[PDB]
Amino acid sequence: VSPPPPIADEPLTVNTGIYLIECYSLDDKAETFKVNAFLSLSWKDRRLAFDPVRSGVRVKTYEPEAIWIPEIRFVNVENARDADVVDISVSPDGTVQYLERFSARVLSPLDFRRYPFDSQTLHIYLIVRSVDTRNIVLAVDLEKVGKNDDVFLTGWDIESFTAVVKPANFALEDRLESKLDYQLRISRQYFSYIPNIILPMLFILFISWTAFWSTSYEANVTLVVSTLIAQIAFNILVETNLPKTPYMTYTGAIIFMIYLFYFVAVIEVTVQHYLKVESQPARAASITRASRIAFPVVFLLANIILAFLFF
Amino acid sequence: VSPPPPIADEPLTVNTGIYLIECYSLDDKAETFKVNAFLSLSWKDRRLAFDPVRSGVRVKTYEPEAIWIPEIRFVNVENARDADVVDISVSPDGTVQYLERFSARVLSPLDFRRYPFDSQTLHIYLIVRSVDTRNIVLAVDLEKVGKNDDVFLTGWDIESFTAVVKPANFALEDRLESKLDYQLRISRQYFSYIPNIILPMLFILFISWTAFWSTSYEANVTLVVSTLIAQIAFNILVETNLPKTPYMTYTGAIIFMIYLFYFVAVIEVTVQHYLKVESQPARAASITRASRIAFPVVFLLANIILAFLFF
Amino acid sequence: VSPPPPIADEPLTVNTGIYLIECYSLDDKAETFKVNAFLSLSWKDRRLAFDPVRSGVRVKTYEPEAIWIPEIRFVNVENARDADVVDISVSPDGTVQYLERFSARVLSPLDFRRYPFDSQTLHIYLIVRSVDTRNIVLAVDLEKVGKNDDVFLTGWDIESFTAVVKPANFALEDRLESKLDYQLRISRQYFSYIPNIILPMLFILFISWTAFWSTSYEANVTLVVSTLIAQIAFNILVETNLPKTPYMTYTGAIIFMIYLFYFVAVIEVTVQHYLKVESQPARAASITRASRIAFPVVFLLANIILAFLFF
Amino acid sequence: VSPPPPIADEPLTVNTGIYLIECYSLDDKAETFKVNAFLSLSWKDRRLAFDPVRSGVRVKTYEPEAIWIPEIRFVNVENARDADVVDISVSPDGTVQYLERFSARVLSPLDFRRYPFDSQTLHIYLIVRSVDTRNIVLAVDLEKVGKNDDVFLTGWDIESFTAVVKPANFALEDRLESKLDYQLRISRQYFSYIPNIILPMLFILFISWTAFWSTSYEANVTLVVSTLIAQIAFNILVETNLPKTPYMTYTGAIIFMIYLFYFVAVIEVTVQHYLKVESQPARAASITRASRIAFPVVFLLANIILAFLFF
Amino acid sequence: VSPPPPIADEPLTVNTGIYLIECYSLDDKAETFKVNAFLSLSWKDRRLAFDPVRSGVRVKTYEPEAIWIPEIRFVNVENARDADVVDISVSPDGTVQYLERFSARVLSPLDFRRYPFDSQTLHIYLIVRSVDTRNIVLAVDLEKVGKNDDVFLTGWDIESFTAVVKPANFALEDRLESKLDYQLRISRQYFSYIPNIILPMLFILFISWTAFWSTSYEANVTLVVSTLIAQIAFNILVETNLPKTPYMTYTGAIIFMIYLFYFVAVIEVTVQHYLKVESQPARAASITRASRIAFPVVFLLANIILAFLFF
């Protein structure tokens, strides 16, 4: 078919609305997420307008093939929106009330720097390409934008589903395009962080620190090195729960610092033994005594430094 | 086509029924499950009613394109229900007897807190959007709701397939919707839990506890630390069988407690050695003697505490 | 179209036949397998019968849209059978000779208790729902049921492809259904079991047993505990080749027993050391001497016990 | 439509040709590979023959629905060939020149016994089922069989794409079938086998062998056993690069032999220590001295034995 | 339909243009990448020409079935381009302005030799097969070739999207083909390399080097061998971030060199101990003293050698 003719030099406003039925399958690595939702569209086609008295009925139900429907697409999707039309209703003035139920895999970038205290702002971009006969602009219908209460993304809290009312109108490949931003705000909700990442790593670190209450080089080497392997093993056990990223995480920084503390530990152990063997057990025990407090304090300061450096 | 005209101001009741042919592919991580089933629908369209004497036949077989069929959908599905119609039969009064065989990936949330003694209640939500001409309500036909005996979900026991007879009628995007809850109750059936998780972890823990029958710091460090690595390695070996969750499991708590017992073990070993070296082998052996009973008893109490705290 | 009218009160027998072109992608975890095969169907539709003299041709080739074809489905499949029709041939009496080439993912349960000496019996269930005009029953055409010689399922031996000639006729959702069982028997063929699972595990176990020819608690702890880690690491290396199951395997039981032998080993090592330190090296060496034979013999007996207990 | 009538009692030869556009996604585990290619077919349908003078044009372009095209399929494929027709050209004599661009997942068995020096011969089997009106035979058009120069299968060298000119004609399910073999020869080309598998494994093995230049049982146990774990760790690090197979590899055999050398090493270490403790340090050092040469030589011989036994 | 007839002996130029909407899912292993983009095509079909005065409209919107559209395909794709047409606009002269939104998985080869400082040049090959009536050639429309600013490929910097203006015209399977190269240049952006690969590996290596400040063979064996395991465990922890390749990487070479330094370390430790036991602690400490500087210096030189050898 053909688009509705203009009022006068003025473009066609299409009233959009997305209602989140089910939000799921968030891929922290791939920066994707799947959504099953309703897309409500509304425009005024005066060609379809009818007198309610002569026709007998107030709202006429139509098939998509019969009526002209604007070509709405999503900007940040992987493939076809896999949509099925729910209901088309034309009011006597010609205002079409479109509704479809779609399921799409959305590519929204993710920021794990503050992991696992980070919050993500998910984007759904709605696009419409203006044809040469008439120009098309998008709008937001606030009553038709929401989310179901039962929407669950395990490990996160679904804060708000909102949209940027003002569209981003720009020129692309010699034609006008109207873009709309649908923002899904989610905060992180890891409660087992401390009991299944930090706490057992802190134990493996403290165990190594008992070498400051020992003089046996053979036992100290065994402590610091064996606990280091224990730590790696543990880092492999939690490897899945950790985010694979080209940038440095907050948790990623803690982990690095642990590896630095194992090195500094070995330095001490090595020094304590070298001073003892080089007949100066005066300094050798002075250092080992300080290291009993120097290691915990410097660790707490360095952790306070990063926690401030990230937050 | 168009929906059947009403009796008088009263809505159209659609008699639903789901019969489970095959239930499979449960993703404990993604909280999904796949089901192959029959969907039986029944409504009264008086337009299709016919006299059995004049026509000659009692029940007329129809194609989906020919007849009006209500737009039934599933709320918690990943995509299109991938359905194929089995048989449409209209009785002389106009009662349509619909039947389809569908296969859908259902998103039902899972609760692993009581893992692996937890039970899950799986949801299948049936929805129908009322159009403006007439309002549609859903109902349950108890003879047409069941499950095949051969339905297997390995590692679980399929208890019951039932449905909430009373539908949840609510207003969404300016129109009425009727929702139906289909509940699939499954209990867990892990029998190799103890022989392939608890028992070998308890061995790795008891081995470490032999350091209470030893005075050699070099052998004690080797015992407690090497068994700790053994434990981590084992936790990596059972990592697959364990549930990845943002919350704390019952099994997840046991595991944590093990890591705490390794720490307390090291503390003892460290103390025993420090009192010996600081020329007081009176206290050093008093503690090591108590720790022979203090560790098993405190472990059994702390396990009784959690088992009560979860169940 | 409509089904062929009956002979007299008697149902329509549909002669089935499956010929395995390619059998592949067996998922030991998911209990699935993929198959590419021919499905041959044959029924007598007298409406299509023709005189060979008047028509000129003996067998008429038809399109699926033209002729009535029974609604045959598979019971235990994941989705649509993804079938394409090869050839439809009607003989002068009206006997239709249907043939299609399909590819389906079949859900057949698996039993790994006797792993890796277990044999599996794979099921393909053929179903046909009887409509109200006439009742439909299934039959097997023995010449049209076979398998290609080149059919390979790596790691297994394809024994036989057969079918239960007598169908399972039952009442479902107020209508008759005819079910047919197609059985694919496969035995296991793991030849590197012993060289890449048992043999290196038995070495890691024997190495630990050298602590019965040693008196050094420091070396004995190092032996038994370090070999225990070696064993876990090895169990992680073979973790992939091992079956993930909620029940206890034969190999799974051997593995458990190994972990129990490490514990009993430690008990001995601990006892030998405690008697030595407690000034009784008479008993301490008596036990270590017996353990040299007590451990191998009790291991061989306990393995003979399980091998009998499973087979 | 219907097939072309025969010349006289003689069958229809269909001239085939496959040209490899892109070859990719080889699954060493699943024994699959994906290919994007051109399929050129040519047969003589005299019904379509035309006079070039009267018609005006030399070659008539047709749609697949219009013309009869033989039902060509692939034997060893996973699903539908996902083909799109490029061009159909009929010459004045009636010789049809078919061309399609398909993408299929081919199941060709693989032989990793000589891994990673093994070569694979990939199969693409073309099939055509003869109908009752006329019998169909396949042929190869040597000018229409090739491969693109840019065809890359990383980690392999694409040697040759050829085909067995003589087809395999046989009887299946009461009808004739013509089969054609398309062979893709690829040799293995992993170059850092030695730097990333053999060389570091040989280091972990040599390190263990320093226990022949040592008398300390505590250090020898630590060497042989700790290096054994190091070896397992390393075998887990290269686990991905290794082929999962039910049969024994060449590399798989080397690996086994390493595990046997660790056992024999421990035996020596255990014996050396037992003779020393049993007051005979004459034999105890004689063995340790021989083992300095006995282990390298027996290793080189045993490796020469396997390298000969496989190649 | 049929292609537009020629001007005179001259081919039809099709003006192409690809605009990158979303670039994502890069598989470093499979050498694939997914792209969602606009494909703009323009050719002159004079058959479609029309008078704007008589028709009333300046540009006629058409359906793909109505008009002839050139058969454009991609050379290096996995399957069907999964395209949906956006807008077809014919000007009064007959110049068609085609536009589609496609999503395809592109196979472009990758070069990880300089990983993680490597740059990749991604290829998108456009192809059009000339039919016998008229020859088809491709061209590039520079205003219709670009990329969206929001295009993100995490861990890489999207430098430029350009195209080789001159097409590659060649003869294939007896007909002319026009090929166009679309180049996507990306450099790597790993910032967590040093903190999560090199730095912790360098710590595990330096720790081992403390054995040059020690004389205890028991502690030296424990250091060098236990740190070696630590290193393997760490190499398994970073195994994911490392590229699986048949060739040698820059990072892969560093890793190899580390394994060689562990071997040379053991040689030293073994030599130091053998000279001590063979009553020459003069040389034994001379070597251990030099190795304190010989190991760091030779490591820095060997790293400078490779960094120069790759860059």
Side-chain angles (χ1 to χ4, degrees), chain A residues 1 3 29-32 71 73-80 105 107-110 125 127 129 131-133 170 172-175 177 179 217-218 221-222 224-226 228-229 232-233 235-237 239 242 244-248 252 255-256 259-263 266-267 270 273-274 277, chain E residues 17-19 21-22 24-25 34 36 38 40 57 59 61 82 84-87 89 99 101 103 143-145 148 150 152 154-155 189-190 192-196 199-200 203-204 206-207 210-211 213-216 218-220 222-223 226-227 229-230 233-234 236-238 240-241 292:
Chain A
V1 0
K29 178 134 182 84
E31 288 161 295
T32 78
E71 286 180 73
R73 296 182 317 272
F74 286 112
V75 198
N76 59 332
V77 283
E78 293 225 325
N79 55 347
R105 201 180 169 190
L107 288 139
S108 175
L110 308 168
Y125 291 116
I127 202 81
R129 193 171 165 94
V131 65
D132 192 76
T133 45
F170 65 98
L172 178 54
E173 283 188 311
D174 295 71
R175 285 200 179 174
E177 298 217 47
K179 193 183 81 194
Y217 187 55
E218 294 78 31
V221 155
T222 294
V224 180
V225 180
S226 284
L228 171 78
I229 285 151
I232 315 301
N235 193 350
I236 277 142
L237 179 73
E239 188 189 20
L242 297 165
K244 262 124 194 185
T245 53
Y247 56 92
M248 185 71 61
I255 293 316
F256 179 66
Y259 295 153
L260 186 79
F261 267 61
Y262 269 98
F263 189 63
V266 162
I267 303 287
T270 309
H273 166 70
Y274 198 73
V277 70
Chain E
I18 318 170
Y19 176 93
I21 294 154
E22 286 293 332
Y24 59 104
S25 202
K34 293 177 179 269
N36 204 289
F38 278 149
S40 59
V57 286
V59 278
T61 315
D82 188 68
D84 304 327
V85 192
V86 185
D87 185 68
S89 278
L99 190 85
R101 196 187 162 172
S103 51
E143 271 53 57
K144 297 195 115 66
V145 185
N148 179 38
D150 309 318
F152 73 91
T154 201
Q189 259 196 359
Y190 198 10
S192 179
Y193 187 42
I194 62 103
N196 284 141
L199 281 181
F203 296 177
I204 294 169
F206 299 154
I207 289 163
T210 66
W213 280 268
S214 174
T215 50
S216 178
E218 294 80 30
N220 293 354
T222 295
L223 285 169
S226 283
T227 54
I229 287 155
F234 197 77
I236 278 143
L237 181 74
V238 294
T240 43
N241 301 285
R292 292 170 193 213

Side-chain angles (χ1 to χ4, degrees), chain E residues 107 161 170 182 201:
Chain E
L107 289 139
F161 189 55
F170 65 98
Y182 280 80
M201 268 166 173

Side-chain angles (χ1 to χ4, degrees), chain D residues 165-190 192-291:
Chain D
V165 283
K166 193 85 88 76
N169 288 90
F170 65 97
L172 178 54
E173 284 188 308
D174 294 70
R175 285 198 179 176
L176 190 134
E177 299 217 46
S178 188
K179 192 183 83 193
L180 273 184
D181 188 22
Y182 279 79
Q183 299 172 324
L184 186 53
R185 264 161 283 256
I186 56 165
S187 58
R188 207 151 206 153
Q189 256 198 2
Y190 179 76
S192 65
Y193 176 43
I194 64 103
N196 284 138
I197 299 94
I198 302 305
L199 280 181
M201 265 166 173
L202 288 193
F203 295 178
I204 294 170
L205 182 77
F206 299 155
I207 289 161
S208 89
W209 292 357
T210 65
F212 307 133
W213 280 269
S214 174
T215 50
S216 178
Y217 186 55
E218 293 78 31
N220 294 352
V221 155
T222 296
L223 285 169
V224 180
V225 179
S226 283
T227 54
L228 172 77
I229 287 152
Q231 160 60 32
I232 316 301
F234 200 79
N235 194 349
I236 278 147
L237 180 74
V238 293
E239 186 191 23
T240 42
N241 301 285
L242 296 165
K244 262 124 192 183
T245 53
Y247 57 92
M248 184 72 61
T249 319
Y250 156 78
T251 304
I254 286 175
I255 293 316
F256 180 65
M257 205 189 52
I258 298 299
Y259 294 153
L260 187 78
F261 268 60
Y262 269 97
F263 190 64
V264 160
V266 164
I267 301 289
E268 185 279 350
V269 154
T270 308
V271 162
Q272 160 195 46
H273 167 71
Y274 197 71
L275 298 166
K276 270 194 174 68
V277 70
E278 276 274 302
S279 298
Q280 195 171 353
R283 260 200 272 183
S286 294
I287 279 149
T288 308
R289 275 183 270 99
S291 301

